[PDB]
Homo-oligomer: A and B are copies of this chain.
C-alpha cells in the first residue's frame, strides 16, 4: 500500500511488478516528487517476496523527457540559503531515487517506448535489461547544455554500458546515444520493431514474451544470480551517487542551470 500518483501507476501480475508512466501528453516529464515516488515503488516491489521482475513501462511517444522544467521554475520562491534550497530540492531527491535503482534486488527491465532524457535516461541505464519499441529510440544526457554534470549514476553506467570514448563524445558535446550505438553495445536486448503510435501494444507484447520466457525457470536463481552480479559495481555506483549529487550543487547554486532551464 502506497499513495496514488496520477502520473505513475503500478500493478502486480504473477512474478512481475509493473510500473507504468501514464502521462503521455507531457512526454512523461517528472517532478521531484515523482522521482521519489518511483523510488518508493521500487522499494515496495523489492519487499514483495512474490515479485521477481520489476518492469518499467511508459506511454505515448517518449519514455520520458526527464525532469519537469515547470516544476524546477516552481522550486524558485522558505529556505535560509540557495544551498539549503538545492540540498532539499535536488540533492535529496536524486540521491534517493538513484539509490533505489542501484540497490534493487529484483530484475529490472525497461520497456523503452521512445526517447529518454536526463535523469530519466539515467534510470534507463541503471536497468538490467532494456527492450526497445523500434529503432527511433535514443537516450540523451544534456548536462553540458543545461549547465549540470552527470546524474543518476551515469558517471558509472555510461562508460560501463557504452564505453569510455563514446561516453565522452556524447556527454561533452551533448549528443544522443542513438539506437545504432545502443545496439552495437548490446544495451538493447531486443528491438520489437513496432510502431511508435502503440506503446500499449509494445508493452503488452513484452509482457507476453516475458511470461513465456520465465516458464520452467527456477526464479530464485534469477535473484541469486543478480545478487552476485550486482556486487561487481555496487561500490562504484554508491560512491558515484554521493559525489554526483554533491558536486552538482555548485552548478545549481551558481544559477547557470536555472537560466538555461528558462531558455
Contact = CB atoms under 8 A, between A and B. Distances in A.
Interface of A: 2-3, 33, 36-37, 39-40, 80-81, 83-84, 87-88, 91-93, 95-96, 99-100, 103, 107, 128-130, 143-150, 155-156, 159-169, 171-174, 181, 184-190, 213-214, 216-222, 224-229, 231-233, 235-236, 238-247, 249, 251, 256, 260
Most buried by B among A167, A184, A232: A232
B243 A228 contact: yes
A173 B217 contact: yes
6 contacts: A95-B245, A103-B246, A144-B225, A145-B218, A148-B221, A181-B186
A213 B145 CA distance: 11
A216 B145 contact: yes
B229 A150 contact: yes
A99 B242 contact: yes
A interface majority secondary structure: helix
A138 B29 CA distance: 42
A92 B88 contact: yes
Contacts of A107: 168, 172
A156 B232 contact: yes
Given A91-B92, A92-B87, A129 B228 contact: no
A221 B36 contact: no
Contacts of A168: 107, 128-129, 189, 226, 229
A190 B166 CA distance: 10
Given A129-B172, A163-B185, A80 B37 contact: yes
Given A128-B165, A144-B217, A221-B251, A91 B96 contact: yes
Given A91-B92, A161-B164, A171-B229, 14 more contacts: A3-B80, A36-B87, A95-B95, A95-B246, A107-B168, A128-B172, A145-B216, A155-B225, A164-B233, A168-B226, A173-B214, A173-B217, A231-B243, A238-B243
